[PDB]
Amino acid sequence: MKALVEEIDKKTYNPDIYFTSLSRPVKRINYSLADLEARLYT
Amino acid sequence: ILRDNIQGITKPAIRRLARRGGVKRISGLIYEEVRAVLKSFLESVIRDSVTYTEHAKRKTVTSLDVVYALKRQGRTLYGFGG
């Protein structure tokens, strides 16, 4: 059930933000020059 | 033994290692950063040391394993196990 007690770090935890996260996989990277220069110049 | 032995390095020890490097005044985060760099270094070495040991069919790590482990990285540790 719901835990009445919750352990919290002073520096790391904030009540503002709540974040939860878990052949060869590779993150998709765009090789376009105008895309990277467009991202950096905006 | 199995729990948070990276804290075993004392802050005065990092201060003495800073004295060896000629550092006068030291900030706060230096003791954390140097600890993390050591944590990465010991992995980068010990990993290869376990690789050679596993290839040599041994349950015990010797000095030739450490020296030959630092040989391919260009450090070439002399003295023990030369």
Add this chain to the structure above:
Amino acid sequence: RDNIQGITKPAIRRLARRGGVKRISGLIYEEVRAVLKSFLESVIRDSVTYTEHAKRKTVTSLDVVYALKRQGRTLYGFGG
């Protein structure tokens, strides 16, 4: 006689543009020139060593690539 001056200041400025440098001081053009003067010796010396060992009066591409091989630079492309 004094071919090290053959590198123009706008050339060093363009090489600085390739590196992302905005404003450049005066002595940069001299320092970069000296570093190049040392580098060309550090390479060309070994290039003459291999050429002398190969019994040749002409320097080829394999001499330059094999000269940069032992220094860890491992220049690809020409003379691979």
Add this chain to the structure above:
Amino acid sequence: ARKETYSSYIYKVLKQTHPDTGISQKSMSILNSFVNDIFERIATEASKLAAYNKKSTISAREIQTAVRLILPGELAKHAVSEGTRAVTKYS
């Protein structure tokens, strides 16, 4: 005179991956230099590793552990996977 390169093989693998995009000659020479370099890498590491074990024989074990220690965990993991698959399927 004659010479040896990987050209036809790189073109065949290219047809195995993307049989549309072509390859320039200079990039093909760059790939030839890459494969020729990695050959000396793995071969030399297998020579030193064979010298550390006091053995005059180089087997698939030396290539397996060598590839493991000279490559990142991903490339060594998949390289050992597909490599052992091809060798076990061959023998």
Add this chain to the structure above:
Amino acid sequence: SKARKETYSSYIYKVLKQTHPDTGISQKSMSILNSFVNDIFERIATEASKLAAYNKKSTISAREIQTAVRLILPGELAKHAVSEGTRAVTKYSSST
């Protein structure tokens, strides 16, 4: 329990007597010298192997060692090393 091992100990001691026959050498420093000579052996030998491979030759002679020592060492150490080396080799081959 031990079979046998090979080191440079006696030779380092003899050269020590040739230079300064007074000061001694600790065992650990002797092991450091053994590691140094054992390392330079693989240095010059490997460079001679690659240099022999660049010339499309299966033979390694004093030429490969001379040019190799020249290119892998500073001008002073390569100059004196080639000097005394060629002196010792030329004096050796003259005995026949």
Add this chain to the structure above:
Amino acid sequence: KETKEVYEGEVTELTPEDKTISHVIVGLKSAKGTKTLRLDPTIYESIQREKVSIGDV
């Protein structure tokens, strides 16, 4: 058979996070370590009724 969790230590800081009764961060200080824990509003009410103060076990 059941397992129960127990927290004990000297209180360092007490703050309200303040409709609804807000939670409270407790600074309980063990002898062998220090840990902070967020609490329910009800157990906060029980804490306020026990007249606890900073530095009380």
Add this chain to the structure above:
Amino acid sequence: SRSAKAGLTFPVGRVHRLLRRGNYAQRIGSGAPVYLTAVLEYLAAEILELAGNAARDNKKTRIIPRHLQLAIRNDDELNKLLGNVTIAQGGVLPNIHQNLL
């Protein structure tokens, strides 16, 4: 050839004879050249697909050295694999510092 029965591309005989005449060891196993051809074929396939998609991004049906340059530099395992390698006609990455904006 024994490369087709094992599902390979590069010849096993050239690698085996090359290792024999390469002055490596006295005895050579029969599985080592097959293993080496497997690893080299895997890495070559990786470079060919990464540089291939790098050519697909710029809408070109040929692979210029710049596509391979960005393909190797954008990957972490390839950048860590070869950090000293200098590619000709590959250019550099469009790295722009934020403080200069």
Add this chain to the structure above:
Amino acid sequence: QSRSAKAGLTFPVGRVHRLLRRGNYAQRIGSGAPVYLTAVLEYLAAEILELAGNAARDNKKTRIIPRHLQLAIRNDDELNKLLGNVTIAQGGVLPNIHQNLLP
């Protein structure tokens, strides 16, 4: 009699020749290569022995500690440029003191 004495050497030529034969370097080995290698190795070893020897003479000790060899190699430019990655055990560091940190 060994061939090292007639050529004015110290280290044995046979051990280096057989070591190069079993070292899996090339197919053919010349007879002057081991003599040349023993000459170079004897020269370098003599250099390290005399430099570390005078380094022991500076501190007024009749034995060579790793610190004497450390300072002997670091104080020389050709030795420091020769090996820049070499880590010596029990050699310590150099007494390098920055000027801006002085009163």
Add this chain to the structure above:
Amino acid sequence: KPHRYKPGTVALREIRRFQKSTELLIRKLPFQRLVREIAQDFKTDLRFQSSAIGALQESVEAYLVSLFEDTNLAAIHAKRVTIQKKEIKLARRLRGE
């Protein structure tokens, strides 16, 4: 009224222009006479092939650009936009030279 850009505007478009170009930024003849000048005092009366010169110039350019990037970061560590003589020494010696 003349049309003049403020200082620092042309540097950005120059970065955009040169960072998109793979061409060599050094002329062939000065590098030729320079390499021959360095080769004069080593071995007299040598010969240089039509190739291997673009390899020396290519490695020199590609290496010097990275040196200007590391030196640029060294100048950024000092919190300014200007590269200085001490920055080249810092980013040089800190690379193991």
Add this chain to the structure above:
Amino acid sequence: KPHRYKPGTVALREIRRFQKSTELLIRKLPFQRLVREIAQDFKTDLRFQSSAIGALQESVEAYLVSLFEDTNLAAIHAKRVTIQKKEIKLARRLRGE
């Protein structure tokens, strides 16, 4: 009247004291349990010889001292006496890491 040195005096004599000593500045047991801790999640139930531990600790100390020297020079480039977290990153990444 108590006798107290001004701040910065003991640092110099500490530099003189430690720069003359070749001893190891890290205790044996913490480094032992640390190396074993790193070796726990790699291969379970291993063994470490009495040697090879002083080689890891020796290389770690000797390398970290040089890192403190290069980082010290990086702090000098900023014109101050204090080492900062960004100095370790500068002198670290600028060495090729």
Add this chain to the structure above:
Amino acid sequence: IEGEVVEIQIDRSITGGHKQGKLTIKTTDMETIYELGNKMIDGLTKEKVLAGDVISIDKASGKITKL
């Protein structure tokens, strides 16, 4: 709507919008991402949810059921 939650992001109130969050519900046949509805975010922050557990969210009821 039920499935594994691999990634759930929740952001504090900003001037642009009351709350912005995106939860990733992964299932074997289909995997899609939903943008939460405010009070939905109050239900996800109300009871602590750890990524990697299988839950069943009730749209009409407005409560979450962890299976």
